[PDB]
Design an enzyme around this catalytic site. Sequence first.
Site, PDB file in Angstrom:
ATOM      1  N   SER A  81      -7.166 -10.840  -1.857  1.00  0.00           N
ATOM      2  CA  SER A  81      -5.775 -11.256  -1.980  1.00  0.00           C
ATOM      3  C   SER A  81      -5.435 -12.526  -1.220  1.00  0.00           C
ATOM      4  O   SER A  81      -4.312 -13.014  -1.371  1.00  0.00           O
ATOM      5  CB  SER A  81      -4.822 -10.134  -1.533  1.00  0.00           C
ATOM      6  OG  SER A  81      -5.133  -9.716  -0.231  1.00  0.00           O
ATOM      7  N   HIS A 120      -3.707  -5.005  -6.130  1.00  0.00           N
ATOM      8  CA  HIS A 120      -3.244  -6.298  -6.585  1.00  0.00           C
ATOM      9  C   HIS A 120      -3.568  -6.567  -8.054  1.00  0.00           C
ATOM     10  O   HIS A 120      -3.353  -7.684  -8.526  1.00  0.00           O
ATOM     11  CB  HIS A 120      -3.822  -7.444  -5.706  1.00  0.00           C
ATOM     12  CG  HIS A 120      -2.935  -7.793  -4.534  1.00  0.00           C
ATOM     13  ND1 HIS A 120      -3.209  -7.381  -3.246  1.00  0.00           N
ATOM     14  CD2 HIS A 120      -1.756  -8.440  -4.474  1.00  0.00           C
ATOM     15  CE1 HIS A 120      -2.256  -7.811  -2.434  1.00  0.00           C
ATOM     16  NE2 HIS A 120      -1.364  -8.465  -3.157  1.00  0.00           N
ATOM     17  N   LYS A 161       3.473  -2.842  -6.010  1.00  0.00           N
ATOM     18  CA  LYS A 161       3.339  -4.252  -6.362  1.00  0.00           C
ATOM     19  C   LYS A 161       3.777  -4.443  -7.816  1.00  0.00           C
ATOM     20  O   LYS A 161       4.985  -4.405  -8.076  1.00  0.00           O
ATOM     21  CB  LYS A 161       1.904  -4.745  -6.081  1.00  0.00           C
ATOM     22  CG  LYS A 161       1.627  -4.696  -4.568  1.00  0.00           C
ATOM     23  CD  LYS A 161       0.241  -5.171  -4.228  1.00  0.00           C
ATOM     24  CE  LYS A 161       0.097  -5.396  -2.683  1.00  0.00           C
ATOM     25  NZ  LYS A 161       0.206  -4.183  -1.919  1.00  0.00           N
TER      26      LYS A 161
END
Lengths: 400, 396
Positions: free
Chosen positions: A187, A215, A246
């Site tokens: 990330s 992610h 997320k």
Amino acid sequence: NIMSSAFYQQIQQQIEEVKAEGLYKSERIITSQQQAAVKIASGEEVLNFCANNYLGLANHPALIEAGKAGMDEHGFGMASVRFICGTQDIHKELEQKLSTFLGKEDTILYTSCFDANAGLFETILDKEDAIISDALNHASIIDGVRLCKAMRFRYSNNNMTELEEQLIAAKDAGARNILIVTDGVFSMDGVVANLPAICDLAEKYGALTMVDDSHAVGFMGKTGAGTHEYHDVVDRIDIITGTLGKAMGGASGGYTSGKKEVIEWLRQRSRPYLFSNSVAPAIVSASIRVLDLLQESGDLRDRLWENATHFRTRMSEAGFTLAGADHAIIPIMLGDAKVAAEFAERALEKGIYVIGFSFPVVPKGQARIRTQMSAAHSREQLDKAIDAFIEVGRDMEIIK
Amino acid sequence: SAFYQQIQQQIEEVKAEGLYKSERIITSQQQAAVKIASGEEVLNFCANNYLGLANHPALIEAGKAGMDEHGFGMASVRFICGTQDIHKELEQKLSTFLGKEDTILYTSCFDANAGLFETILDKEDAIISDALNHASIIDGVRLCKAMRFRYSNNNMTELEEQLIAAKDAGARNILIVTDGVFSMDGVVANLPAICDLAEKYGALTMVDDSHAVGFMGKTGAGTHEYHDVVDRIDIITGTLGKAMGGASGGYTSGKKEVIEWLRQRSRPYLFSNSVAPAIVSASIRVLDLLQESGDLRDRLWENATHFRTRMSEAGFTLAGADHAIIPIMLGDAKVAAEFAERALEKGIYVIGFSFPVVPKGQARIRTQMSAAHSREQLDKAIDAFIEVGRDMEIIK
């Protein structure tokens, strides 16, 4: 308070040292909902280019309505761990829908992916076993591993040669079970892990695979299932962890997904699941809504990737160095920590909210702005951000 | 594969020991009368819903309004772009409510405890724990490199001994860590004695007040208020997921230096999502509601007193004092299991605990009182318990 005062003085000196290194974290107060254009406490409206709000779902009307409806039907809280009186029908419905979304047999919900990882390794592995970790893994993976008694091995980020070496060293050491553990997306780099090569090596050496796809879930792969779909290794990743906080809505919630046996054993023994509150009904209801919203259309994914392509084109042609490939995280590489801090400040003055990172978060000399694309950015908003970044870089004599 | 076979065999071993956990599927809201997937409606006596806030209309309204004004999620950790004005408002209101300078929010008290000890203490220091502490405390301590000492539950003599041992080992900072309420016993920790020993030996004190915040002490601030040692407890952790609403959320509260350092360095705070706006907004409302009216607390303690009276007078042995957890002590694990089964047949949902959760020979039904129980519902449950106890030849 002479000993307590000594303790607080010690801490205050640590704080002052952090400020002196330029590493103090400050919180900007947002007075609006999370979205492309947020309002901050100063009164300014700024374009948010540092959220994990990848599909703009954090303020999506369908989720807010489903959260409200879930509170009308299933209440505000469970006030219980799952196995006592904290399990509703909607918890099981969400777990079933996540299992099918991800291509796995069963899913266990936690209140965060931090807890999903913390509650995994110690539960399924012990001293007879081995864990082989990519050196760049997320902190919640690291802390889960730290609670585990298994033998630990490390390979340099994305380095399949060192992974093979560590698999051999794990075999040589007598490991019963071997788990290779990787973030699906690194990330700070916007780099997708090399799942094909990892799966080849696991199959060659008889190892299990685990991917933290926090992610990636929601928008990587054709249906948004994650990096195992993106890399066409869906049935070759044994265990997947992830988050609802997320792309999948942004509230909170995490999960572990995999074979029925593993998930059943986690329900019996995973300490965060045994000792922490069941997930709130509003969040469960909205996440059910999310999974349907995401199967209705691939429109939001399409807008995300159009934005990402456009961003790379315009920013690279202006002279910026950008890291990574094929993800919504597109770091602007600036090298120098003070330069990155000044760039973020100048961007804010032009109405753009970004975050810079430097050592120890990223290597010395490889400081960067972690720009994050979002389906929430309109083409005009995206062009305004790119315009501002170009003006800042020209003002700072970084680009011509 | 061999791994999945091994896991399946562990499951089988657990089922054979009689230790397998099953989930009852609730189809209603959390409240006194819940519906389970079979279709039965049962009275719930095993929730942490101590003030009945889990389905209270004010929290549902404040949560909906919080979503309209502040959205569904932050999709960020606090320090990047996850901090709203309402996060700071909740932290300030919690700080004033608990009598501490500052407060840091986490998505659970599990993470507040995990994120506390290793952030403020290292190998030069020592942690002295009550032997009965909660698992999230144990796991926070496991990440901490400090020297570890343990004292038997509620034993101030062993605490003094461990303080002396920690001094002798050269400990720089010393932290005494206790649950505020021992949650299998319904016993409040001996905070006055602990604070005396901490002052005598130069130690910091920390209390996990998860089972107390909302209803212990005059304002419901916790066991430090109950024991009138508010300014002598250095660090307090707690949860929003029990009496204060039941959704999720936790916090650490204390001196501005410690809380600021947690914001800089506490790993769950750096690496986990900020708390969802609906929960923050509802918790802001809760803190006003609980100072606006003491009716819910009153109903809780009225139920608790009535339960102890009718149940003691019928011949039951009950553990603890001054808390909403009032265990029925049954000793024998099979007896407790049968008692829970028979109570369910009469429409009452309780949970029994036995070794390793509680000591061998001290199995119990962990009955939890709630303002959500009407007087009539509580009397129906007590009636059922007495009938079960007579059927089982436990009471006459």
